Amino acid sequence: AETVSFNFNSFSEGNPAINFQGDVTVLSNGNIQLTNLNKVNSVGRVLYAMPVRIWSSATGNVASFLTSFSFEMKDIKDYDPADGIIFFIAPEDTQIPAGSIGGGTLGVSDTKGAGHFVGVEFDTYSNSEYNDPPTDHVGIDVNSVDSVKTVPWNSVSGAVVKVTVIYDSSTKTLSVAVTNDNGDITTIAQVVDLKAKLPERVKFGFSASGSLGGRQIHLIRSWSFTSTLITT
Amino acid sequence: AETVSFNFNSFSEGNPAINFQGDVTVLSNGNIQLTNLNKVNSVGRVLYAMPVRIWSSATGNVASFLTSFSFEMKDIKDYDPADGIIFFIAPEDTQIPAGSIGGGTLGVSDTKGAGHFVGVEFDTYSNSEYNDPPTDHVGIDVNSVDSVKTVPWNSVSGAVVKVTVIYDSSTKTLSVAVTNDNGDITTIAQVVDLKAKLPERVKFGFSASGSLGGRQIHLIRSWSFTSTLITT
Amino acid sequence: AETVSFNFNSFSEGNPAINFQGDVTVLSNGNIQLTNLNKVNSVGRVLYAMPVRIWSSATGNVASFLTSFSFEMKDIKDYDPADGIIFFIAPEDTQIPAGSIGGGTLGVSDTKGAGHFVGVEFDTYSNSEYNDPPTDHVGIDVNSVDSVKTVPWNSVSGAVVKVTVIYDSSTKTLSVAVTNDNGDITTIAQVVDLKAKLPERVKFGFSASGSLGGRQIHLIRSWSFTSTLITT
Amino acid sequence: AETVSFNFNSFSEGNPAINFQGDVTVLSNGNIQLTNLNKVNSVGRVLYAMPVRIWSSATGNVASFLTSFSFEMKDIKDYDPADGIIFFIAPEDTQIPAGSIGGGTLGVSDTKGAGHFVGVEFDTYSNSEYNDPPTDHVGIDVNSVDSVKTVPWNSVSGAVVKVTVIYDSSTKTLSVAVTNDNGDITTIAQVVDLKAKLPERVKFGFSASGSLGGRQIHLIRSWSFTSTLITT
Ligand SMILES: CO[C@@H]1O[C@H](CO)[C@H](O)[C@H](O)[C@H]1O
Ligand SMILES: CO[C@@H]1O[C@H](CO)[C@H](O)[C@H](O)[C@H]1O
Ligand SMILES: CO[C@@H]1O[C@H](CO)[C@H](O)[C@H](O)[C@H]1O
Ligand SMILES: CO[C@@H]1O[C@H](CO)[C@H](O)[C@H](O)[C@H]1O
Ligand SMILES: [Ca+2]
Ligand SMILES: [Ca+2]
Ligand SMILES: [Ca+2]
Ligand SMILES: [Ca+2]
Ligand SMILES: [Mn+2]
Ligand SMILES: [Mn+2]
Ligand SMILES: [Mn+2]
Ligand SMILES: [Mn+2]
């Protein structure tokens, strides 16, 4: 079997295993701050440097994975807490969209909200142009920020949130479990054929964005991942 | 929302939060040993004392849950390592089947392998009478030990295994991620409508069994659980 | 360590984790109203269903706990605002006293004011037969409503009151911090050996009562609790 | 009554309500980092600017207070995680000791471990010269880092810890409740006569320190406080 696994309790700038793109910054406490609070239409993204092979054209197998991470979003004075964080999977050549308006595109799509990626979003702002639900929410995105499926959620300022994601190759099911600060959990699952939406080699990472009037702190505190592809 | 959550790093006999049924024993190290190595057709089960309400007839909602636990199986001299452990959900009145033959019924079904429960089994013995696969395996069981779906696996003696289970109420999907000793992960997912197979109030627990010639150590080391039911 | 913890932001009738005794009712907003405004000598009690083990006869250890809750008392027309709320700890078999006269017994003691419990009372009526102080007050009760110790307080109609309680096993000190509507805090502490007054297994809950002429609204809005017993 | 209350969800440099002393730094996420990871014998302290009157020479009363705060300690590469954090109360003229060696003095005492303060310490290093216990611990300090009383504890890297403290004027009891990451709580209480150890006006704050080889991240995330002195 082909297995890739890593664990980050703290991040550091200069670690060859991580790729920073945009306004990403590494705080003294090891946390990653994705956006710059003083920039208009800010966008920051962090990726695992090494491309992971999620499927083989030789065998036809797709890999399974288990990943968990914790994040924190916090309100800043005078600005609307926006726009949110997104865990995504994209081709190995992925770069922040050219002329990115930040904001509701979460730093992964164009102005229409289209792009080439698959991901789970923790959206803290209702963008009517992308058909966002009227409340904070978690959603499964397949090549667009106009979510395929969403579920009501609640973002608490200064709260450490924990997430666990499981992808089962056989059923092609992607399920997420979000453990809120108060103990409550929120789940969402959707069938996504990674083999038909993405290429053999891909990169995993997080992205966040803001606008002119919408800004807040987007922190990534830890991240562990394991994937296994049956090579036979 | 209605949330139930608990965390067990070590177990102790005398804790009103746990129900012991059968040959269950609590070791000095805080571990739970499910079966008795000196008994024929031994059976031991441990349940969370408080019944959890997984669905409401009033609203029609089903709860979502996230649970993780670690176990260990170890070979003993002269006996075949059998038969395995099973994480199950059953009605609040659940008791070890009358005249239980232990063995391949995992302590949850009658001789035909039928019963009233939903669970995930870590089977270390191929019982042809229940249509078991020819190797160790993980399987989803709905009211029977003749698994609805299974996936090849490998039980390593003396190895601590970790499991994470997510049930999404919306899709009614139950997904499991098993992290082996060597780092590799095994997953299996299946759609199970809990509202149609079980009653409003249920109990969660683990069960293990042996036979005359099949016996091994079955240990439960830790267990954390959280469920949330939307009451609206 | 043996830890029991729960959190209630809202209560609902039908939740197996809660035991209702007496005139208790669950409002549409999730609050619990303890007494019935239309009944003479009304009494209502709510308990956490699962019995908690506060001490072990095996080791000799007593547990420590931290609990916080918020309540509201409101005046109704023509009736004297009485009699008050009481946070108590009693044996697992605890029931409203037979032939309870409600009133100044707070639904936990007999006519002489004796009973088997430990609790903190927020008394809004001076009952001279139980040697009550001449003003509203908070008191520590050990098997009697004739308080071991009391401190002047002031009950404000329609005001949300917050309370935090800490019990330190080592010193066997029980301290209470009451945060009034206007910001001021009131505290009271007393040494109470739980191991000598109560049995190994107990139940936690609140109780309220009224009389013929004394009636008012008694609301419980939220409640969180955590206890840890060192099992070694 | 005389009441002083404040609440900090995030800290900012430039807020006249806070006094920074030493290597204190305010991160972009609003957290306060007490020590400098690149300095030998680093020391950082933060105090509430306004002096609080804990007792009156006119009446003879002592104030009661309820305070809660959350912190985080994190391991850095190559350095021993030391030395810890301390919540303290000292005279209004309090300054970092002259020629402070940092380390085991927690930035509040001289080399002998003597000083003029009262506080609760979260010690992550056993300094034999101050008679420290052999494990991590919480302790009550009265004018010395050679704790009057301590209790075993465990510091988990990257874990958000919550603490609640209550001081009852009548009994002169100070009790602390520490809620660990895994849910368990730790408590410690001690009788301390504030009126005989400190002057009428004092200042509240936190302090942290490191040495040459001992360094780690010390963060203060939030802090709320309320004190009430009966003026009559
Ligand atoms: C006016 O633009 C909108 O501003 C919001 C905050 O107010 C969000 O950032 C949206 O993404 C953005 O489109
Ligand atoms: C006939 O006994 C069989 O023995 C095995 C070990 O050999 C297992 O325990 C099987 O369940 C049991 O059916
Ligand atoms: C005449 O009965 C009294 O009524 C009061 C209000 O007037 C309180 O309820 C007292 O407990 C009760 O003894
Ligand atoms: C010899 O210096 C010591 O270093 C330790 C870490 O190893 C701690 O910092 C002690 O306080 C300090 O006294
Ligand atoms: Ca949005
Ligand atoms: Ca079998
Ligand atoms: Ca009274
Ligand atoms: Ca020390
Ligand atoms: Mn969205
Ligand atoms: Mn099987
Ligand atoms: Mn009274
Ligand atoms: Mn110490």
UniProtKB/Swiss-Prot annotation, chains A, B, C, D:
Entry keyword annotation includes Calcium: yes
Molecular function per GO: carbohydrate binding; metal ion binding
Domain of life, per lineage: Eukaryota
Record flagged with keyword Transmembrane helix: no
Keyword tags: Calcium, Lectin, Manganese, Metal-binding, Signal
The protein's assembly and partners: Homotetramer.
Name of the protein: Galactose-binding lectin
